Amino acid sequence: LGMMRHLYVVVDGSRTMEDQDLKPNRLTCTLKLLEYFVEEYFDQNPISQIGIIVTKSKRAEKLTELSGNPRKHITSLKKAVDMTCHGEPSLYNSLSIAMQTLKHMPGHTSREVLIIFSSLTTCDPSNIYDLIKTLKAAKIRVSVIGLSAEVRVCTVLARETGGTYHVILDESHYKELLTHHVSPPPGNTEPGLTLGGYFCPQCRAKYCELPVECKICGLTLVSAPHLARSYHHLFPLDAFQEIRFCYGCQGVCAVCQNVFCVDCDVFVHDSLHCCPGCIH
Amino acid sequence: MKLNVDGLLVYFPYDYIYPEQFSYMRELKRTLDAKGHGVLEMPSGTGKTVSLLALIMAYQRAYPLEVTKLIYCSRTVPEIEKVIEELRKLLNFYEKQEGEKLPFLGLALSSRKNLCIHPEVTPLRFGKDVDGKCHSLTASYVRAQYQHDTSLPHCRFYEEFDAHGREVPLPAGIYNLDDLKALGRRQGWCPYFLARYSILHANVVVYSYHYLLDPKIADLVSKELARKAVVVFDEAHNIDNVCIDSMSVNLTRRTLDRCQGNLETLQKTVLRAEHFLGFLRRLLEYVKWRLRVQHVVQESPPAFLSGLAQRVCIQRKPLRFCAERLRSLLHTLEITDLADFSPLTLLANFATLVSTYAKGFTIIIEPFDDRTPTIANPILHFSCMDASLAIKPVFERFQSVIITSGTLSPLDIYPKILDFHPVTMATFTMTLARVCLCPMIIGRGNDQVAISSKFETREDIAVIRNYGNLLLEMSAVVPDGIVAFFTSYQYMESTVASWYEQGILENIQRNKLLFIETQDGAETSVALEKYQEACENGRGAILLSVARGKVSEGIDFVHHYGRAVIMFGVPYVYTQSRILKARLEYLRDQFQIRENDFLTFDAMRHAAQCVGRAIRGKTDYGLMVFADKRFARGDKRGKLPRWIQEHLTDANLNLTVDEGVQVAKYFLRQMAQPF
DNA sequence: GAATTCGAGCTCGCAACAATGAGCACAT
DNA sequence: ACACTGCGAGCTCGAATTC
Ligand code: SF4
Ligand SMILES: [Zn+2]
Ligand SMILES: [Zn+2]
Ligand SMILES: [Zn+2]
């Protein structure tokens, strides 16, 4: 179904991130829904990555490098709750940091940038309209979730590179907009599985209980039960036809001719995802 | 789309009509069948132009004997080219619906500086020079030696035009200004004189105001054209100021000493008729003697003509033909250029205006200048008061004349100033899928201090801070462009400088760049192209200007250029000038218009024109604040038109500065979302 | 059955009203 | 030969409980 995604999340750190009409700090409501967003992203996407960049005082600083750690992002967003948020942000600098290290991903992925933008002004030392010609060349899909207004350059950035642009009604609308980005849009990597509690198979580098890549030899270490949940869409199971004694619950499949019931026909197709007579 | 108005089959060139726009054609048909005038009002610029042209062009098919010609008077040359391009879009729609051709031609007229092919005369900058360099190449004494066909100076385009451009007319194909030059190029004819010759046999004709309102022009281009026509005065909210400036001459010392040089150089040529030179040398002495006084200002509109016969003994009977013989004396003298004799024609036009037109005129000699007790620069104004002495030929010659704009502020002032009786006098209002405009009257400040731009409430810092605290707190919630009209140049300069001495202008420059519109044209067009570029990228800009300026009347702020339009006070004229203080005397005796009710009407038509320059389209949304306490009263907010008054509620009527932002921020959040 | 408390609406009298700036298109 | 738009006064109701 979906493909791999290397999604940066750009967070605004302007002076206007101390504004009301949210949770009483505008930055800490953004960081609250983002920690929910990182958790929901890695569950509908097994082998993807997340980077988080912030912008403050005409400069961009990479808060977290592009790595598929579903814990190292949440413990860094909890650290940056008390950020000072002085100055106006930049959009040329943030899409240059998110392009100097997103240009070098392989071509069979879906590289993306999600800009959460609260300020209205992007004071930047160069022209923006050559980045959008460059981002369209590098197949980067930039989507913006705006706050309180609609900037013109954020619609040109969204519709030319290929993303979307939406503006917040309230906090309930903000959580609904982030849940549209967890779904993936419709090459062979080398991972190593992690038998023995959680060790490394390539260089015996023991570390904690994570699906993160190896910090020494550079091999991605995933858990094979996590990839197993995303099966049963490929070669899926078919429906049945219906016209006492059952086969599943013991009290009609057209493959192996095994009679089911109404409480089993709702359970095999929805939750079990495999015919109990076909396994024999 | 075979749309049906109450008697016609109107071919509309679109698919969706707006329910107010169909009712515009019913009231427009109600004028033409009644053979009378009409004062209509509908906001937009396009959509109004394509609906008016759809009915009248379809009206002359069902009744081809009642109306024959449509004269469309627009403001200037950019809107002349816009109306013609909306006409061929309707014509090509007729070419698909019927599959035929039509005996239907439509022109566009402008000055000789626009229709010009000859290379040595086109790159002249000023408009009054291209007439002279033409007149040195095409006058009847210049072509007098061209009957021998020698190598004397001549225009090849004019001399080719009268030999072949008479037997065949223009066939079809609605012409722009550029299309007429392209037709004149590939055929070899004049573009200017082909447009003037073929204006008598046309169906739609689009020129400016001054071919019909100016009395010394309309007897040359539009005297014998049509006795059964339809005139449309598009965007004619300031139609009275065009009618006053056309019949008003202004004389000063700088002009009069140049007439002495023209009278000097005419005396060297007669020796190489003579009673006419002693006539003008007599008249130039008297007008200089009247400007020689240093006394109180005085007015005497027919008593000038008595004192002109006392010391100088010149009667008024030869004075009526003063400008006539000077046009004939320069013909028999065969002068090359005529832009040099422009002061002497201006003195001769003054002489033929004080002899005939004296019912509602005045002559104001002002030795005491503006604000200074002794500066040697006196000036006499020959100011017209009655604005209905310029449409009285237009209201009588034609069949029906339709005065339409978007901001006719009360509909009953216009038939009172202009002496006529309409048959509809209707208004309209746009219908929308949202509420695309949120007007508000930001009154008292953030600490319950009045905000008004009066004359005694301008130098106190409790108001200048509340103007600075407003533009600061609106430049953080409005995206990509704010137009802030001030009331004058000396008030815009004395407030930005008083924001810089305080700590307010440094906090606006953090959000948005600020560009200032100045009087000169080079620095304005530079500061206007960096404004429209700073709204396209993410910086966001502020264009703070004046209200009776060039940007407020010419530049059309489309969406995301000027989301907010901030009026920094009611834009009054100088209410103590001696010209305006005499015009309100005529407006109080005649027509009984109260002198306070005219200054508000004049101001609410400039405060609604530039505010209404922020919405042009279906998807355009726009904030429009009115940062003055005086806007809140009944005789001022009841004057702004019915398409920006139907959304001005009573909650948004005396809003403070901080509460005006949370109506600004809530409106811009609602508009940013899809339909 | 005839008061109250606090609300609503419509008539109408009362007292005192305001109004400050700057330039190019069109005829022989 | 002065005086615009706002605004508390009487007047008379209402709902529900009192005296
Ligand atoms: S006569 Fe024709 S070519 Fe000559 S100046 Fe006039 S418009 Fe131009
Ligand atoms: Zn390893
Ligand atoms: Zn069963
Ligand atoms: Zn089976």
XYZ file of N, CA and C in Angstrom, chain A residues 100-232:
399
model
N 19.014 20.175 2.465
C 20.402 19.742 2.347
C 20.603 18.313 2.828
N 19.683 17.795 3.635
C 19.726 16.420 4.096
C 18.456 15.639 3.803
N 17.565 16.164 2.970
C 16.476 15.388 2.396
C 16.656 15.166 0.902
N 17.657 15.801 0.295
C 17.962 15.556 -1.107
C 18.636 14.205 -1.303
N 19.278 13.681 -0.264
C 20.112 12.494 -0.376
C 19.406 11.213 0.056
N 18.096 11.247 0.241
C 17.367 10.007 0.440
C 17.178 9.307 -0.906
N 17.008 7.982 -0.912
C 16.775 7.277 -2.180
C 15.439 7.643 -2.807
N 15.350 7.399 -4.111
C 14.238 7.859 -4.914
C 12.953 7.076 -4.808
N 12.940 5.958 -4.091
C 11.736 5.155 -3.949
C 10.935 5.504 -2.703
N 11.197 6.650 -2.089
C 10.494 7.084 -0.894
C 9.575 8.249 -1.233
N 8.919 8.779 -0.201
C 8.045 9.945 -0.318
C 8.546 10.970 0.688
N 9.505 11.786 0.269
C 10.049 12.807 1.149
C 9.046 13.940 1.320
N 8.873 14.388 2.560
C 7.836 15.352 2.894
C 8.355 16.309 3.956
N 7.745 17.491 4.006
C 8.022 18.499 5.024
C 6.686 19.058 5.486
N 6.435 19.025 6.788
C 5.209 19.567 7.363
C 5.580 20.782 8.201
N 5.170 21.963 7.755
C 5.497 23.211 8.433
C 4.297 23.623 9.266
N 4.453 23.613 10.583
C 3.458 24.184 11.480
C 3.874 25.629 11.721
N 3.061 26.567 11.244
C 3.452 27.968 11.160
C 2.421 28.818 11.883
N 2.864 29.543 12.903
C 1.988 30.435 13.645
C 2.181 31.896 13.288
N 3.402 32.303 12.957
C 3.665 33.693 12.629
C 3.126 34.023 11.245
N 3.099 35.318 10.945
C 2.642 35.802 9.655
C 3.778 36.219 8.744
N 4.950 36.510 9.301
C 6.047 37.137 8.584
C 7.228 36.184 8.546
N 7.786 35.973 7.360
C 8.956 35.121 7.182
C 10.100 36.015 6.715
N 10.816 36.609 7.663
C 11.941 37.474 7.327
C 13.141 36.597 7.001
N 13.538 36.573 5.735
C 14.553 35.654 5.250
C 15.478 36.366 4.276
N 16.771 36.033 4.278
C 17.747 36.828 3.527
C 17.823 36.527 2.039
N 16.955 35.682 1.492
C 16.976 35.403 0.065
C 15.549 35.329 -0.453
N 15.424 34.993 -1.732
C 14.131 34.905 -2.390
C 13.547 33.514 -2.181
N 12.236 33.446 -1.948
C 11.612 32.155 -1.676
C 11.268 31.439 -2.975
N 10.995 32.186 -4.040
C 10.406 31.609 -5.242
C 11.392 30.827 -6.100
N 12.665 30.745 -5.716
C 13.570 29.792 -6.339
C 13.723 28.515 -5.530
N 13.357 28.532 -4.246
C 13.274 27.286 -3.495
C 12.123 26.428 -3.985
N 10.989 27.051 -4.311
C 9.827 26.294 -4.748
C 10.047 25.714 -6.139
N 10.908 26.334 -6.944
C 11.362 25.685 -8.166
C 12.371 24.585 -7.871
N 13.105 24.702 -6.765
C 14.082 23.685 -6.391
C 13.414 22.522 -5.662
N 12.456 22.821 -4.777
C 11.712 21.772 -4.086
C 10.851 20.963 -5.046
N 10.366 21.585 -6.120
C 9.628 20.833 -7.127
C 10.555 19.947 -7.945
N 11.824 20.333 -8.070
C 12.789 19.494 -8.766
C 13.220 18.305 -7.922
N 13.327 18.482 -6.607
C 13.766 17.425 -5.708
C 12.626 16.540 -5.226
N 11.426 16.703 -5.799
C 10.232 15.894 -5.514
C 9.833 15.928 -4.042
N 10.052 17.053 -3.379
C 9.675 17.225 -1.983
C 8.260 17.782 -1.933
N 7.439 17.234 -1.043
C 6.017 17.553 -0.951
C 5.786 18.333 0.338
N 5.749 19.656 0.230
C 5.678 20.535 1.392
C 4.224 20.876 1.674
N 3.771 20.586 2.888
C 2.424 20.909 3.330
C 2.503 21.754 4.590
N 1.626 22.748 4.696
C 1.659 23.715 5.785
C 0.340 23.645 6.540
N 0.416 23.664 7.866
C -0.747 23.849 8.723
C -0.585 25.208 9.384
N -1.429 26.154 9.000
C -1.278 27.517 9.453
C -2.102 27.824 10.678
N -1.837 28.992 11.251
C -2.547 29.462 12.430
C -3.022 30.887 12.188
N -4.317 31.111 12.427
C -4.989 32.400 12.597
C -5.181 33.225 11.329
N -4.585 32.828 10.205
C -4.687 33.599 8.970
C -4.232 32.737 7.802
N -4.121 33.365 6.634
C -3.740 32.684 5.400
C -2.707 33.530 4.669
N -1.450 33.130 4.747
C -0.361 33.836 4.086
C -0.356 33.420 2.622
N 0.001 34.349 1.732
C 0.004 34.051 0.304
C 1.124 33.084 -0.065
N 2.305 33.237 0.543
C 3.437 32.393 0.172
C 3.248 30.962 0.663
N 2.369 30.738 1.638
C 2.092 29.401 2.128
C 1.095 28.653 1.259
N 0.412 29.340 0.346
C -0.435 28.663 -0.626
C 0.341 28.349 -1.896
N 1.258 29.241 -2.275
C 2.160 28.979 -3.385
C 3.113 27.842 -3.054
N 3.592 27.778 -1.812
C 4.473 26.698 -1.384
C 3.751 25.361 -1.352
N 2.478 25.360 -0.972
C 1.749 24.107 -0.845
C 1.330 23.558 -2.203
N 0.740 24.399 -3.050
C 0.132 23.912 -4.281
C 1.127 23.722 -5.417
N 2.334 24.276 -5.319
C 3.313 24.050 -6.374
C 4.156 22.812 -6.107
N 4.595 22.614 -4.863
C 5.339 21.403 -4.540
C 4.427 20.188 -4.462
N 3.197 20.361 -3.997
C 2.229 19.287 -4.082
C 1.472 19.000 -2.804
N 1.753 19.748 -1.748
C 1.132 19.528 -0.460
C -0.202 20.228 -0.325
N -0.657 20.337 0.918
C -1.902 21.010 1.252
C -1.615 22.217 2.134
N -2.641 23.040 2.332
C -2.550 24.188 3.220
C -3.889 24.379 3.910
N -3.880 24.364 5.240
C -5.104 24.473 6.017
C -4.885 25.418 7.188
N -5.977 26.019 7.657
C -5.952 26.994 8.740
C -6.841 26.483 9.867
N -6.425 26.745 11.101
C -7.042 26.181 12.296
C -8.342 26.915 12.606
N -9.406 26.150 12.875
C -10.577 26.702 13.548
C -10.354 26.776 15.054
N -10.034 25.642 15.670
C -9.805 25.545 17.107
C -8.853 24.382 17.374
N -8.735 23.990 18.646
C -7.838 22.894 19.001
C -8.373 21.549 18.528
N -9.694 21.414 18.402
C -10.255 20.182 17.862
C -10.001 20.068 16.367
N -9.951 21.199 15.665
C -9.607 21.186 14.251
C -8.119 20.944 14.039
N -7.292 21.332 15.010
C -5.852 21.142 14.897
C -5.480 19.672 15.051
N -6.171 18.951 15.935
C -5.905 17.525 16.083
C -6.436 16.731 14.897
N -7.486 17.225 14.240
C -8.024 16.530 13.078
C -7.130 16.725 11.862
N -6.453 17.871 11.765
C -5.587 18.120 10.619
C -4.305 17.308 10.694
N -3.793 17.066 11.902
C -2.578 16.276 12.040
C -2.830 14.799 11.772
N -4.049 14.322 12.014
C -4.373 12.924 11.767
C -4.546 12.604 10.291
N -4.642 13.611 9.430
C -4.651 13.372 7.997
C -3.247 13.158 7.448
N -2.216 13.507 8.216
C -0.837 13.365 7.782
C -0.189 12.070 8.249
N -0.848 11.300 9.116
C -0.275 10.027 9.534
C -0.484 8.941 8.490
N -1.388 9.147 7.538
C -1.594 8.093 6.555
C -0.624 8.262 5.392
N -0.043 7.176 4.896
C 0.908 7.285 3.795
C 0.186 7.434 2.469
N 0.776 8.146 1.515
C 0.194 8.217 0.175
C 0.399 6.908 -0.565
N -0.550 6.510 -1.427
C -0.445 5.245 -2.162
C 0.649 5.257 -3.227
N 12.535 -0.657 -4.090
C 13.846 -0.815 -3.490
C 13.828 -1.713 -2.270
N 14.971 -2.315 -1.959
C 15.100 -3.217 -0.822
C 16.113 -2.649 0.158
N 15.663 -2.373 1.376
C 16.526 -1.892 2.440
C 17.167 -3.103 3.128
N 18.215 -2.869 3.920
C 18.844 -3.944 4.684
C 18.618 -3.734 6.175
N 17.588 -4.329 6.769
C 17.471 -4.337 8.225
C 18.023 -5.611 8.850
N 18.290 -5.517 10.148
C 18.679 -6.668 10.937
C 17.772 -6.843 12.135
N 17.206 -8.031 12.307
C 16.259 -8.234 13.388
C 16.995 -8.443 14.710
N 16.244 -8.368 15.804
C 16.836 -8.077 17.106
C 16.618 -9.157 18.168
N 16.897 -10.414 17.813
C 16.774 -11.547 18.729
C 17.650 -11.376 19.968
N 17.182 -11.941 21.082
C 17.941 -11.972 22.316
C 17.604 -10.815 23.227
N 16.315 -10.603 23.464
C 15.887 -9.370 24.082
C 15.996 -8.271 23.050
N 16.992 -7.390 23.200
C 17.283 -6.344 22.212
C 18.797 -6.145 22.152
N 19.433 -6.836 21.210
C 20.848 -6.722 20.884
C 20.991 -6.249 19.441
N 22.226 -6.245 18.953
C 22.483 -5.953 17.555
C 23.069 -7.173 16.861
N 22.586 -7.518 15.678
C 23.072 -8.731 15.014
C 24.327 -8.510 14.187
N 24.640 -7.256 13.868
C 25.767 -6.979 12.986
C 27.068 -6.748 13.745
N 27.008 -6.094 14.906
C 28.225 -5.802 15.652
C 28.072 -5.986 17.156
N 27.005 -6.655 17.612
C 26.738 -6.966 19.026
C 26.666 -5.718 19.905
N 26.194 -4.608 19.346
C 26.052 -3.357 20.088
C 24.746 -3.409 20.870
N 24.838 -3.760 22.149
C 23.659 -3.812 23.002
C 23.203 -2.405 23.356
N 21.914 -2.137 23.185
C 21.331 -0.911 23.711
C 19.901 -1.213 24.151
N 19.104 -0.165 24.341
C 17.823 -0.277 25.027
C 16.749 -0.831 24.093
N 15.498 -0.764 24.546
C 14.377 -1.448 23.900
C 13.755 -0.532 22.845
N 14.464 -0.398 21.726
C 14.072 0.540 20.685
C 14.083 -0.119 19.312
N 13.274 0.397 18.375
C 13.425 0.018 16.963
C 14.404 0.902 16.199
N 15.255 1.643 16.914
C 16.166 2.583 16.262
C 17.303 1.832 15.569
N 17.918 2.501 14.597
C 19.046 1.953 13.862
C 20.280 1.856 14.753
N 21.248 1.062 14.296
C 22.487 0.858 15.034
C 23.349 2.110 14.964
N 23.747 2.616 16.131
C 24.547 3.832 16.193
C 25.993 3.616 15.769
N 26.441 2.371 15.636
C 27.835 2.101 15.318
C 27.978 1.682 13.861
N 27.338 0.581 13.478
C 27.496 0.042 12.134
C 26.486 0.600 11.142
N 25.497 1.361 11.602
C 24.565 2.010 10.704
C 23.508 1.120 10.093
N 23.131 0.031 10.755
C 22.082 -0.848 10.261
C 20.792 -0.600 11.028
N 19.681 -0.545 10.302
C 18.384 -0.359 10.934
C 17.961 -1.650 11.617
N 17.564 -1.554 12.877
C 17.151 -2.722 13.647
C 15.663 -2.599 13.939
N 14.856 -3.362 13.215
C 13.415 -3.346 13.392
C 12.995 -4.626 14.099
N 11.771 -4.617 14.608
C 11.179 -5.791 15.231
C 10.251 -6.451 14.223
N 10.514 -7.724 13.930
C 9.708 -8.452 12.954
C 8.226 -8.640 13.301
N 7.774 -8.695 14.565
C 6.322 -8.614 14.795
C 5.687 -7.294 14.402
N 6.440 -6.192 14.364
C 5.852 -4.923 13.948
C 5.533 -4.924 12.460
N 6.408 -5.513 11.645
C 6.127 -5.628 10.221
C 5.042 -6.653 9.932
N 4.787 -7.574 10.862
C 3.811 -8.626 10.625
C 2.379 -8.121 10.693
N 2.134 -7.009 11.388
C 0.779 -6.480 11.484
C 0.306 -5.872 10.176
N 1.225 -5.423 9.328
C 0.879 -4.798 8.063
C 0.743 -5.800 6.925
N 0.684 -7.092 7.231
C 0.310 -8.093 6.243
C -1.212 -8.179 6.199
N -1.728 -9.206 5.519
C -3.135 -9.555 5.286
C -3.888 -8.534 4.433
